[PDB]
Design a protein around this motif. Structure first.
Motif, PDB file in Angstrom:
ATOM      1  N   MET A   1      64.517 -18.495  14.978  1.00 19.00           N
ATOM      2  CA  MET A   1      64.719 -18.282  13.550  1.00 19.00           C
ATOM      3  C   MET A   1      64.850 -19.610  12.807  1.00 19.00           C
ATOM      4  SD  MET A   1      64.871 -15.332  14.732  1.00 19.00           S
ATOM      5  CE  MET A   1      65.241 -14.836  16.413  1.00 19.00           C
ATOM      6  N   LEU A   2      64.942 -19.520  11.488  1.00 19.59           N
ATOM      7  CA  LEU A   2      65.281 -20.650  10.639  1.00 19.59           C
ATOM      8  C   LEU A   2      66.775 -20.610  10.335  1.00 19.59           C
ATOM      9  CD1 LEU A   2      62.236 -20.008   8.376  1.00 19.59           C
ATOM     10  CD2 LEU A   2      62.556 -22.230   9.406  1.00 19.59           C
ATOM     11  N   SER A   3      67.327 -21.768  10.014  1.00 19.52           N
ATOM     12  CA  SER A   3      68.735 -21.843   9.645  1.00 19.52           C
ATOM     13  C   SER A   3      68.958 -21.244   8.262  1.00 19.52           C
ATOM     14  CB  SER A   3      69.233 -23.288   9.651  1.00 19.52           C
ATOM     15  OG  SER A   3      68.791 -24.010   8.505  1.00 19.52           O
ATOM     16  N   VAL A   4      70.230 -20.942   7.969  1.00 20.15           N
ATOM     17  CA  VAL A   4      70.606 -20.455   6.644  1.00 20.15           C
ATOM     18  C   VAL A   4      70.063 -21.380   5.571  1.00 20.15           C
ATOM     19  CG1 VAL A   4      72.532 -20.026   5.110  1.00 20.15           C
ATOM     20  CG2 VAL A   4      72.613 -19.207   7.422  1.00 20.15           C
ATOM     21  N   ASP A   5      70.291 -22.689   5.719  1.00 15.99           N
ATOM     22  CA  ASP A   5      69.876 -23.606   4.672  1.00 15.99           C
ATOM     23  C   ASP A   5      68.345 -23.739   4.613  1.00 15.99           C
ATOM     24  OD1 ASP A   5      72.534 -24.001   3.826  1.00 15.99           O
ATOM     25  OD2 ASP A   5      72.853 -25.704   5.160  1.00 15.99           O
ATOM     26  N   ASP A   6      67.648 -23.637   5.753  1.00 17.43           N
ATOM     27  CA  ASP A   6      66.182 -23.580   5.732  1.00 17.43           C
ATOM     28  C   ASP A   6      65.671 -22.360   4.956  1.00 17.43           C
ATOM     29  OD1 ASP A   6      66.115 -25.856   7.380  1.00 17.43           O
ATOM     30  OD2 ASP A   6      65.783 -24.678   9.216  1.00 17.43           O
ATOM     31  N   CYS A   7      66.206 -21.175   5.259  1.00 19.99           N
ATOM     32  CA  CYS A   7      65.803 -19.963   4.529  1.00 19.99           C
ATOM     33  C   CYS A   7      66.072 -20.098   3.033  1.00 19.99           C
ATOM     34  CB  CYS A   7      66.544 -18.746   5.080  1.00 19.99           C
ATOM     35  SG  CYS A   7      65.972 -18.245   6.693  1.00 19.99           S
ATOM     36  N   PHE A   8      67.228 -20.651   2.671  1.00 21.19           N
ATOM     37  CA  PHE A   8      67.514 -20.896   1.264  1.00 21.19           C
ATOM     38  C   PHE A   8      66.449 -21.786   0.636  1.00 21.19           C
ATOM     39  CE2 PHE A   8      69.890 -23.202  -2.106  1.00 21.19           C
ATOM     40  CZ  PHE A   8      70.155 -22.114  -2.911  1.00 21.19           C
ATOM     41  N   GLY A   9      66.062 -22.854   1.345  1.00 17.27           N
ATOM     42  CA  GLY A   9      65.028 -23.727   0.826  1.00 17.27           C
ATOM     43  C   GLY A   9      63.692 -23.023   0.677  1.00 17.27           C
ATOM     44  N   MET A  10      63.359 -22.150   1.634  1.00 16.32           N
ATOM     45  CA  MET A  10      62.164 -21.312   1.507  1.00 16.32           C
ATOM     46  C   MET A  10      62.240 -20.445   0.261  1.00 16.32           C
ATOM     47  SD  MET A  10      60.030 -21.819   4.005  1.00 16.32           S
ATOM     48  CE  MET A  10      60.013 -22.554   5.632  1.00 16.32           C
ATOM     49  N   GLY A  11      63.390 -19.804   0.028  1.00 14.43           N
ATOM     50  CA  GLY A  11      63.517 -18.952  -1.140  1.00 14.43           C
ATOM     51  C   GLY A  11      63.437 -19.732  -2.438  1.00 14.43           C
ATOM     52  N   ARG A  12      63.953 -20.961  -2.448  1.00 18.48           N
ATOM     53  CA  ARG A  12      63.865 -21.776  -3.655  1.00 18.48           C
ATOM     54  C   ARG A  12      62.434 -22.217  -3.898  1.00 18.48           C
ATOM     55  NH1 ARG A  12      66.114 -26.666  -3.474  1.00 18.48           N
ATOM     56  NH2 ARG A  12      65.846 -26.743  -5.758  1.00 18.48           N
ATOM     57  N   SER A  13      61.713 -22.514  -2.816  1.00 16.82           N
ATOM     58  CA  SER A  13      60.297 -22.859  -2.916  1.00 16.82           C
ATOM     59  C   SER A  13      59.484 -21.714  -3.504  1.00 16.82           C
ATOM     60  CB  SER A  13      59.777 -23.235  -1.539  1.00 16.82           C
ATOM     61  OG  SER A  13      58.363 -23.390  -1.535  1.00 16.82           O
ATOM     62  N   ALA A  14      59.708 -20.496  -3.007  1.00 14.52           N
ATOM     63  CA  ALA A  14      59.021 -19.347  -3.584  1.00 14.52           C
ATOM     64  C   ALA A  14      59.373 -19.168  -5.057  1.00 14.52           C
ATOM     65  CB  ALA A  14      59.372 -18.089  -2.805  1.00 14.52           C
ATOM     66  N   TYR A  15      60.659 -19.296  -5.391  1.00 15.78           N
ATOM     67  CA  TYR A  15      61.097 -19.129  -6.768  1.00 15.78           C
ATOM     68  C   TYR A  15      60.416 -20.130  -7.691  1.00 15.78           C
ATOM     69  CZ  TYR A  15      64.422 -19.126 -10.688  1.00 15.78           C
ATOM     70  OH  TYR A  15      64.996 -19.042 -11.920  1.00 15.78           O
ATOM     71  N   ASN A  16      60.319 -21.370  -7.251  1.00 14.65           N
ATOM     72  CA  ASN A  16      59.724 -22.378  -8.122  1.00 14.65           C
ATOM     73  C   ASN A  16      58.217 -22.158  -8.279  1.00 14.65           C
ATOM     74  OD1 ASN A  16      62.080 -23.720  -8.909  1.00 14.65           O
ATOM     75  ND2 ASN A  16      62.192 -24.787  -6.955  1.00 14.65           N
ATOM     76  N   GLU A  17      57.600 -21.353  -7.413  1.00 15.12           N
ATOM     77  CA  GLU A  17      56.208 -20.943  -7.616  1.00 15.12           C
ATOM     78  C   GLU A  17      56.064 -19.711  -8.502  1.00 15.12           C
ATOM     79  OE1 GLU A  17      53.775 -22.737  -6.728  1.00 15.12           O
ATOM     80  OE2 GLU A  17      54.650 -24.111  -5.254  1.00 15.12           O
ATOM     81  N   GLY A  18      57.168 -19.120  -8.954  1.00 13.41           N
ATOM     82  CA  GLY A  18      57.116 -17.859  -9.653  1.00 13.41           C
ATOM     83  C   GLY A  18      56.884 -16.674  -8.746  1.00 13.41           C
ATOM     84  N   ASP A  19      57.117 -16.840  -7.444  1.00  8.64           N
ATOM     85  CA  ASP A  19      56.903 -15.796  -6.457  1.00  8.64           C
ATOM     86  C   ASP A  19      58.242 -15.104  -6.204  1.00  8.64           C
ATOM     87  OD1 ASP A  19      56.431 -14.144  -4.328  1.00  8.64           O
ATOM     88  OD2 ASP A  19      55.259 -15.670  -3.227  1.00  8.64           O
TER      89      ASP A  19
END
Lengths: 9, 95
Positions: free
Chosen positions: B1-19
């Motif tokens: 799996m990814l770490s909590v903070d990695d997943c958070f970074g993934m979610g922020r990346s999606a958010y900044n794309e408007g996804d």
């Protein structure tokens, strides 16, 4: 417009 | 799996794309791992900030309200969250 605001980034 | 903070970074990346859909997927996973007691620098309130807005964009109205209430419960001086709560409570006649 009228609405919520999310994180700026 | 990814770490909590990695997943958070993934979610922020999606958010900044408007996804917003992928923001939801990642932030839900963060919440799961935070509740499992996993160590993380990210706080629940920060996750709820992204998640509440993303689920609103996807049309999930009472969940956006619920998550905004939870966000403010954990960060009461969050002025933007307070404005969001006022908006959702007026929109849904839940004042």
């Amino acid at each position: 417009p009228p609405g919520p605001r999310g994180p700026p980034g | 799996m990814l770490s909590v903070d990695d997943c958070f970074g993934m979610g922020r990346s999606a958010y900044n794309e408007g996804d917003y859909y992928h923001t939801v997927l990642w932030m839900e996973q963060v919440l799961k791992q935070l509740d499992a007691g996993e160590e993380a620098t990210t706080t629940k309130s920060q996750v709820l900030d992204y998640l509440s807005y993303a689920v609103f964009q996807l049309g999930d109205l009472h969940r956006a309200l619920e998550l905004t209430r939870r966000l403010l419960s954990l960060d009461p001086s969050h002025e933007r969250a307070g404005g969001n709560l006022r908006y959702f409570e007026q929109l849904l006649e839940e004042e």
